[PDB]
Write a protein that binds this ligand. Structure first.
Ligand SMILES: COc1ccc(OCCN2C[C@H]([C@H](O)CO)[C@H]3CCC[C@@H](C2=O)N3S(=O)(=O)c2cc(Cl)cc(Cl)c2)cc1OC
Length: 121
């Protein structure tokens, strides 16, 4: 609980969550919903590797369909509309030992700030 709440089903500390702003939303998105988020991702050296804010449009994906790294299918499923959270995503829940060059190094813990903007069934 020092670095956040373990939200993994295994309780292996692989995805840790800190709420930054509570959503006024009531339900989480459901599997298959189209979800709309803003995010900023940083490496452990503090370097921003990507941000939807920098494109001035949301990132959109279907929840729970393996369209994104595991940490996101887990983390976004816990969020309510309007919520902002920080997610610490160990490599086993992200890009693993390979990484994804050039932007993601090998064995990289990823640090996301995610805002849940909307979702639609
Ligand atoms: C089922 O397993 C995966 C499914 C998809 C995977 O990567 C592509 C999807 N993706 C990329 C998006 C953006 O489209 C990239 O600009 C982005 C947001 C959603 C989470 C994650 C992300 O999951 N990434 S990212 O911020 O971790 C990311 C940014 C950049 Cl610049 C490069 C890469 Cl490789 C990842 C990766 C997966 O496993 C490693």
């Amino acid at each position: 609980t020092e670095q956040g709440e373990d939200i993994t089903s295994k309780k292996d500390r692989g995805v840790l969550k800190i709420v930054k702003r509570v959503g006024n939303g009531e339900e989480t998105p459901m599997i298959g919903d189209k979800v709309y988020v803003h995010y900023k991702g940083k490496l452990s050296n503090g370097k921003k590797f990507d941000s939807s804010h920098d494109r001035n449009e949301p990132f959109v994906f279907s929840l729970g369909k393996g369209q994104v790294i595991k940490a996101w299918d887990i983390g976004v499923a816990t969020m309510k509309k309007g919520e902002i959270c920080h997610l610490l995503c160990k490599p086993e829940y992200a890009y693993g030992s390979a990484g994804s060059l050039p932007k993601i190094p090998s064995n990289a813990t990823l640090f996301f700030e995610i805002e849940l903007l909307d979702f639609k069934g």
